A paper describes a structure:
The VWD assemblies are formed by the VWD domain, C8, trypsin inhibitor like (TIL) and E domains, except the VWD’ domain that only has the TIL and E domains. We determined the cryoEM structures of the wild type D3 assembly of the human [name] mucin and the structural single nucleotide polymorphisms (SNP) variants Arg996Gln and Arg1201Trp that affect intermolecular interactions. The D3 assembly forms covalent dimers that can appear in two alternative conformations, open and closed, where the closed conformation dimers interact through an arginine-rich loop in the TIL3 domain to form tetramers.
The structure of the [name]-D3 assembly was analyzed by cryoEM at pH 7.4. The cryoEM reconstruction of the D’-D3-CysD1 recombinant protein reached higher resolution (3.2 Å) than the isolated D3, even if only the D3 assembly is visible due to flexibility of the D’ and CysD1 domains. The covalent [name]-D3 assembly dimer is formed via two intermolecular disulfide bonds, Cys1132-Cys1132 in the C8-3 domain and Cys1174-Cys1174 in the TIL3 domain. However, the Cys1132 intermolecular disulfide bond is partially reduced as observed previously in MUC2-D3. The [name]-TIL3 β1-β2 loop, unlike the other mucins and VWF, is remarkably rich in arginines (20%). During the 3D-classification processes, a second [name]-D3 assembly conformation was observed. These were estimated to represent 17% of the total [name] particles. Here the first mucin D3 assembly solved at neutral pH is presented. Interestingly no major structural differences were observed compared to the low pH.
Numbering used by the authors:
A (entry chain A), B (entry chain B): 899 to 1229
Write the structure that this text describes.
């Protein structure tokens, strides 16, 4: 149906065609770039880049800020907030900002959306119309998992490190090098890392085990827990688990894995005094009535979004959508 | 009114009279022991001991299990569960187990209670009738903060290390030594530790700043965050903050400090499908109606207990207290 490019953790990548690899660097890297070369096929050119900074002590790097360039508009996503810099006094704003669950969903009219958790990871969804016309770190959308190493010169190179380094934006950035083993570097956290990441092989994800192989995700969890030693390994572990959770949710079946002792969420914080409407939905609501989305309309386009969601009462069931409450009606 | 002996974090102690110090060891240590020596004043003798294990890599130790001895009854508190070993087929069971908020409150008829968070810390409350007749790691209850160093031989010694080592249970245990500086040992976590523990000096605890000095608690938070490097520093930071939170709550005023990004609780997990009764009370309910506590009775003896609490509807407002729901009536 729709392909997905997933970037999460400490340089873990997943191409549109299904190829997976690992690469770490400290520079600006372009994930998806439209209109490769000078060929402009009467379409707008969109460019998304990520900023990586060295997090930890072994040498691993994680994404910190994401910049979006399209139609002369520049958007910045840092510290969990959206800041617009590039402003054009013409045409029409093509991006819409939505807050569904724990993700920061943005939508564009061209057919490209983003799923940002505001911490480390980012999910990219592309329409099938852009097949065979997109190049970048996510690989060419050609449904072939063996030719996803175009090093910006239309030349497939098996060197993953060279392929990653060939996509650097600033020429002055230092060249990336091969990483070490975080578990070997810090052998006093291996037992804790294994005990925490053993939940992937537990009976909770029995349904996911029959569709998605968890070996790669388990190894990623172990590596992240061994490397996330700069303070806040709980967030790294939660993101590593949520990556596989969203991957399994994309298939179509949802599984509840959260636990008050394992990555908890405070859904009651948004509830006002004397009221209770917010609830936790592991599978995410299909469609809800908001100010911009009337009751008669229901856009079932995105699936697999977990987080706190409100349950408006029958009286005043329209979500006001700007100050987190349900209202009778809005203009 | 009532004195309190608090043990939390990595060997942080607070005597009944108000003296505070720090000591780390790896053995069984007696906190409060009744009837010091051979003097039996026609009262039952209670003895509470704690088990410390080396947690981390610098050399700090934290409590893991707590054993209670009274009336020939032995109780064990490990892995967040209560296990009874010492059983006597005579007299009557003098202990009651209650689950209020996040603490595991146990009550005894003699006048001694315990507040266990099931993770690291333990709070002891003693009746004023036991003044000047209790010796142990909590010091003699004599309202004097300068003679709280009785090293089991009725001799006050200024050496905190010697005073702590003189209370070891097993003679074969190794003698404790002076600890090092965790922040100096791991200088790559100082910035993160300071950024996390700066919440104590923020405007949230402005009311607490006028009653309890937060310098000692801030130093304890910094040291714990620098030392808790074995995996799970979030739990260590949460316990360090909750210690000062409970200390301020004991004064009489309550302040809400929890945040969905700072030590969250999943109060919605206990809510059944289609119902919403559980809520988070920073100050704790004064009294609630349960199966063993009718509506006409309200025991207002303990204050300062935060956590998830249920709000039963007017219909069937009696808490069933054994399977987490509200029922109309129970025998
Ligand atoms: Ca390809
Ligand atoms: Ca004393």
């Amino acid at each position: 149906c729709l392909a997905t490019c997933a970037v999460y953790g400490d340089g873990h990548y997943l191409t549109f065609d299904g190829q997976s690899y690992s690469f770490n660097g400290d520079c600006e890297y372009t994930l998806v770039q439209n209109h490769c070369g000078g060929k402009d096929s009467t379409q707008d050119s969109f460019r998304v880049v990520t900023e990586n900074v060295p997090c930890g002590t072994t040498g691993t790097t994680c994404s910190k800020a994401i910049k979006i360039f399209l139609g002369g508009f520049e958007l910045k996503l840092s510290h969990g907030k959206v800041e617009v810099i590039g402003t054009d006094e013409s045409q029409e704003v093509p991006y819409t900002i939505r807050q569904m669950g724990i993700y920061l969903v943005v939508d564009t009219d061209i057919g490209l959306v983003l799923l940002w958790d505001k911490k480390t990871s980012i999910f990219i969804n592309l329409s099938p119309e852009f097949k065979g016309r997109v190049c970048g770190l996510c690989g060419n959308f050609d449904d072939i998992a063996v030719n996803d190493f175009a090093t910006r010169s239309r030349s497939v190179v098996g060197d993953v490190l060279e392929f990653g380094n060939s996509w650097k934006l600033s020429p002055s950035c230092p060249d990336a090098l091969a990483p070490k083993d975080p578990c070997t570097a810090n052998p006093f956290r291996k037992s804790w890392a294994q005990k925490q990441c053993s939940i992937l092989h537990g009976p909770t994800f029995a349904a996911c085990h029959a569709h998605v192989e968890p070996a790669r995700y388990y190894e990623a969890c172990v590596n992240d827990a061994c490397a996330c030693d700069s303070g806040g390994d709980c967030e790294c572990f939660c993101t590593a688990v949520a990556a596989y959770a969203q991957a399994c949710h994309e298939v179509g079946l949802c599984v509840s894995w959260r636990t008050p002792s394992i990555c908890p969420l405070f859904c009651d914080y948004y509830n006002p005094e004397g009221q209770c409407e917010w609830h936790y939905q592991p599978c995410g609501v299909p469609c809800l009535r908001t100010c911009r989305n009337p009751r008669g309309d229901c856009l079932r386009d995105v699936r697999g979004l977990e987080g706190c969601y409100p349950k408006c009462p029958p009286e005043a069931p329209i979500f006001d959508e700007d100050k987190m409450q349900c209202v009778a009606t809005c203009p």
